[PDB]
Amino acid sequence: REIKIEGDLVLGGLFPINECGRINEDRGIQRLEAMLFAIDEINKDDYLLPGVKLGVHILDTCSRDTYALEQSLEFVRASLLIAGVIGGSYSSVSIQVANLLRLFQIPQISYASTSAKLSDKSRYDYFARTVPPDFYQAKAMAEILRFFNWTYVSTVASEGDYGETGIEAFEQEARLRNICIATAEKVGRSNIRKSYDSVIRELLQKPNARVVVLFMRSDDSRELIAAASRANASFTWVASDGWGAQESIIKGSEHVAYGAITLELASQPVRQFDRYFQSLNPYNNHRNPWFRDFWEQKFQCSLRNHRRVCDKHLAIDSSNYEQESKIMFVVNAVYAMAHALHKMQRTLCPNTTKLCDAMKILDGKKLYKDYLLKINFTAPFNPNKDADSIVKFDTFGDGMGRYNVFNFQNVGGKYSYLKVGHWAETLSLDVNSIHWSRNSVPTSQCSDPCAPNEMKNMQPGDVCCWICIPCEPYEYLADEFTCMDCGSGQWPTADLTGCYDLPEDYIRWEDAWAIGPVTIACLGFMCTCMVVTVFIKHNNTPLVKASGRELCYILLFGVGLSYCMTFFFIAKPSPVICALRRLGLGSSFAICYSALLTKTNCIARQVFICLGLILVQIVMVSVWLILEAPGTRRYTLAEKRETVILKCNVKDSSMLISLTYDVILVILCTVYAFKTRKCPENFNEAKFIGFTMYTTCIIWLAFLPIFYVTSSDYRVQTTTMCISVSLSGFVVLGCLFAPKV
Amino acid sequence: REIKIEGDLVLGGLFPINECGRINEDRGIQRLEAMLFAIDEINKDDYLLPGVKLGVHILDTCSRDTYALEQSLEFVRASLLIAGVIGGSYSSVSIQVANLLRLFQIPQISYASTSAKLSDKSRYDYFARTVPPDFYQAKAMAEILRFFNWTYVSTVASEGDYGETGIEAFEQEARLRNICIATAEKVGRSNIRKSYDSVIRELLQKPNARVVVLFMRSDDSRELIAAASRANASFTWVASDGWGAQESIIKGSEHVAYGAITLELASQPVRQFDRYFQSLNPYNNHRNPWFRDFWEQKFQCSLRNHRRVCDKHLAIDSSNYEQESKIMFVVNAVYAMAHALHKMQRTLCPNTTKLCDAMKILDGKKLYKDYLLKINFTAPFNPNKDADSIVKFDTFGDGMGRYNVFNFQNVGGKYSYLKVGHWAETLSLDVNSIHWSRNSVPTSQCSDPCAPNEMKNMQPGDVCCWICIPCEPYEYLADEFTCMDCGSGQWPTADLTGCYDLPEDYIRWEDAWAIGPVTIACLGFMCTCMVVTVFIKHNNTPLVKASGRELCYILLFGVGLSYCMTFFFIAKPSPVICALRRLGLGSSFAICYSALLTKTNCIARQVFICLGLILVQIVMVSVWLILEAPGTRRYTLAEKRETVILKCNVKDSSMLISLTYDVILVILCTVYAFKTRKCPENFNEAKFIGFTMYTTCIIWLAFLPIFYVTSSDYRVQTTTMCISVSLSGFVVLGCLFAPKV
Ligand SMILES: COc1cccc(C(=O)N[C@H]2C[C@@](N)(C(=O)O)[C@@H]3[C@@H](C(=O)O)[C@@H]32)c1
Ligand SMILES: COc1cccc(C(=O)N[C@H]2C[C@@](N)(C(=O)O)[C@@H]3[C@@H](C(=O)O)[C@@H]32)c1
Ligand SMILES: *[C@@H]1O[C@H](CO)[C@@H](O)[C@H](O)[C@H]1NC(C)=O
Ligand SMILES: *[C@@H]1O[C@H](CO)[C@@H](O)[C@H](O)[C@H]1NC(C)=O
């Protein structure tokens, strides 16, 4: 089981064919028929090793680490001849052969070993890939979980030298663009969490992690899809090139990965392969001893007594297979050895064409410094040469990171893969053909964004998580993380940034006071109207002649003003109104004192009536000073969180100070009118004035101490002030008209 | 630089000597002079390979991975002779030589390679240690962070195949005994966090992680102590056997690790070593070419023109060195090869003694199945044979986990290590000789335990962290995580589990009422006393004869009872007292109705006085029914969070219902006594009774509507009820005595 065609030079090469059940049919013998294709297409091509036939010596690796070492001794046991192997297509296969070809100085060219450990050039100093490392693959998994703003993800990586050193470079590149990984764990096949149902349940315990980064190998992604359909669930499988663009890892679970996003490595494929690999039947196939049963296992044929025996019209056309992505890399990484062993011949022995004596030892260290910086044109089957087709190794012997972004679009019945994107500067994937799980762009964040009514961003200690919590309704949410207050008087709008002020109320609308006391004040116009018969119609009455005929024009005209000052208590507050209420209340109780205590010396006496007529302005001039000097415009009281009630610019004691200027003259009114409690003059002094000395001004000391207790203060001061003069309007001044007529 | 002494058989062995600056002097040539000691002590010992001389072929490893492979080819390049190597003392040295000795079937016996990857017997099937794995070392780091209850730790492990597979078995054994690791990171020498100041600052950003699990190698623990003293800080270094019991990793930082707890592997050392290694001078030392400059580098001597040249009286006694712990393991793991190559000779060729023809090929696979189950007595220098000294491999080729627990006690000036503990069942370390950092048993938990006044355990989503938060003061903290309420009436004690009830108040102490109204009631005894002159002294008065002489014994005796029912309003509430208040208040106002409305028909009238004398019990019999049928015991009102005020078992309307039974007879009292407002009989009816018809019962309708408004209800009903009868006690019944005398 090893090909041996002779040649003046020998190229090695060890390929994963077995897996020893299957022949692997996609990344296996579809690559061994490509490297052997290029060797068949070198010896015919002149000006590239002319006259020096290249022969190969190929062995399988059985897709296993410690079996590759037993097959790697077939090269070097003649050295204790080979001028370079073509590496191993897997990762753990090609690490622990570079730890044995290093000792004999044999160069190794891998073509798929995307691992980060193989750039430490102090240990593997004979290892140049033609595939970019996995640091440029975590960089395409941070810029693809930020173009969709997924933040709360859950990474899964297989154990070994591929996952654990390709996910330790993702956790140090997802904690740099604020991506919060929930659950990271191993899945590998040596007793960590080897039950695949024990790890698909852990990804189901989190309900808010629908984006799972599958950085696993090609073995633990056909046993994590065959264990994510039994224990039935679904996510958005974002996966590395372990999954890749393989249509044989998904052969029996075509509905659970129906929105998967995988990224292969970008390759414009070769177009002379499908005229060669398609024309290889088991009848005409000599060299490789694994191709004689490849068509047996692929087409399920036979050659013991199994199913349908091979008919000769069974070939491999484009209805069977699609050419693998990493077939450009196989024919590229074998010409790089063919450009090294040609430029060496142009240096050591340029006069001769065949193998000289100076190139018969094959100095390995000199072969690694004539080759590591060797750029070239291309694999010559791919056109657009200058448009990114230059094979070129870096200082570490790598390629350039060029990553297509595939998608598992299940649209045409046949569940096929489909390209959407790019890399190397550009995240250029177009969201118009990407199908998804449940046909929607999914979200995975730690906490949901909530309503902007009272919530706020409260991130306790980290960046990826927060919590929305209600705050006060009088505040505004300005900085979107802590709401702030605007103060009393103003109320925030629906935007929760600015606050709008409020007026007081419609005091004059009804309030059970815009119709009640003004109807009592509607009869207040009838107090002076009913007393107008004493005024002008019957001014020559003998009882009025013995009364204060000049005094009743002060005693009853202001009684109508006491029935008129309540009108200003219902209008809008203003310096023309609420300061006039300070001028009105002093004028209203300028009659209850000047017609009770003064009329004891006038109506129950004109030699001193000039001082009594000047007694109304005895404090009213000083009351004019307190109605002019302090602030007499407006105010606005603010109670608990909803009050804009606009009282005038005084206090309760300021009205009490004006109340003290007149009621003290009414306090000693009945004390100065207690002597005439039995003896009248015209049956009116002891019969009427003593009643208004007691009963009238007691109401002036009843509701007035209650004026500083109430809150709305609607009719406690408007009605009762106008109602208190109706006693002294009728029982002493309208009472005289009762026996008149 | 390789020892070669001949023999009929050959034992290998590769030791870490260089590091190529130092000769490492503790784990290096103090081991190579021990394996070569046992080979010098085998050929003299009969009955253990008799007549077959054992020769060694020893090479250095330079303490490096990929340099051991260039020296491992010196054994096997004659096979493309050696009958077994004695392994590599390091971890990464002895993994990637078992991946090359496996191919030629050569057994390898390590003696310090404590790693968990080397028990996967599908790959390294020619590798039997004599040191227990690292799964039994994480099991001694979970049971040592639970005996001190440290929970919030921060693990640090070096990169490679020792740390990352010895700390991935600690994180899966610290999340099993509730130990919450804060910061886990790599420190290894390939561009992860290779600045050691960048990782000692990350352990300083957490202020609550003073316990750091140092699972690093012997290289990143002399550059993490030489970078934890420059950027000066201190912790409690709990460290694996990378640190171990080495007194050369701490040579210049003897104060920063002064409370360190390290665990080596338990070994009762050999006692024939210090008679052999102490007697090896550079004059008499032939074989090993590294010992000729070992004493040059150890004693800082010379042999270009450096310091003090070697005098011949310079030897190595017990004042220089202490024998390493893993020297029992070197002489043990080389006799296991000597018991394998002896029991094979007793099987294949027992008739002859020397090497026969059947043992001249040295079948390697048969050498690994005659040996892997081979128990033996001991290395024969260690006594107490049956007391745990049996060399024995398990099914995976291991030892038994026996771990001493050292301590860096800096007590004697010379900062020496000191043993405290044990393992293999028992955490038996005794906390009486353990010095610490700052002489205290440290703590590292996520959140501190708080005061039990109002706090509670609030663990949001995890187990390792919580938060203490204050709750209500009327609740008790029962379950130590959520405080619970006990309800009104009872108040929790200092234990915050049980609640104690409260009485109401001392109502009769002062309350501005235990001296005020009772002094007014002290004169209440003087109302009947001043009226006693009308009672017995002057009962034959003509004004009293025209008055109700039989009626005043009902009108004034109950007036003293109205001055006596206020006494029950100050005593303790009870069915004898507060239900008597219901019987008293009806009896108190059985006089204000029967001497105002009834005395209008008696004192201002005996043909109908028998119905008036029966009018006191006209509703009092039904008032006795409501004083007997409902609940008449007690009650207890509970206001907001502090109130146990015990009113009697009625409502305010229940007293109002008793008030409605008598005051309605007093409501129509003045209406029935409004006719005699001008005409008296003995100048007492229209002059006194009409005053008590108006002024007395108006006070009965003044304070009684205020009795259901007050909260404390101290003197609003006790004083004013007794004060209201003083009007009808004096102005109508004491007023008649005023013109009498
Ligand atoms: C089955 O045993 C193992 C062990 C380790 C890895 C893998 C594995 O899945 N390798 C995958 C991913 C790959 N990009 C890489 O080199 O890791 C290349 C691509 C290829 O060559 O076709 C494979 C499999
Ligand atoms: C300097 O380069 C390296 C690389 C890897 C590990 C180490 C290392 O520190 N090994 C330490 C710890 C050990 N118990 C083990 O076997 O890992 C044995 C004990 C000994 O044999 O004396 C050493 C050093
Ligand atoms: C997150 O990314 C999505 C992807 O288009 C975008 O629509 C959205 O606006 C982004 N959110 C923020 C806050 O930038
Ligand atoms: C935690 O361990 C220490 C170590 O002795 C012990 O004293 C303490 O009581 C333990 N705490 C609990 C809650 O068991």
Swiss-Prot record, chains A, B:
Q: Which residues cross the membrane?
A: 514-536, 551-571, 583-601, 607-627, 653-674, 688-710, 721-741
Binding residues annotated for L-glutamate, in chain numbering: 91, 112-114, 162, 241, 326
Organism, by scientific name, is Homo sapiens (Human)
CDD domains named in the record: 7tmC_mGluR3 (cd15448), PBP1_mGluR_groupII (cd06375)
> Subunit info?
Interacts with TAMALIN.
Taxon lineage: Eukaryota, Metazoa, Chordata, Craniata, Vertebrata
Which keywords appear in this protein's UniProt record, sorted alphabetically? Cell membrane, Disulfide bond, G-protein coupled receptor, Glycoprotein, Membrane, Receptor, Signal, Transducer, Transmembrane, Transmembrane helix
Tissues and organs where the protein is expressed, per its UniProt entry = Detected in brain cortex, thalamus, subthalamic nucleus, substantia nigra, hypothalamus, hippocampus, corpus callosum, caudate nucleus and amygdala.
What this protein is called in its record is: Metabotropic glutamate receptor 3
Residues with glycosylation annotation: 149, 232, 351, 376
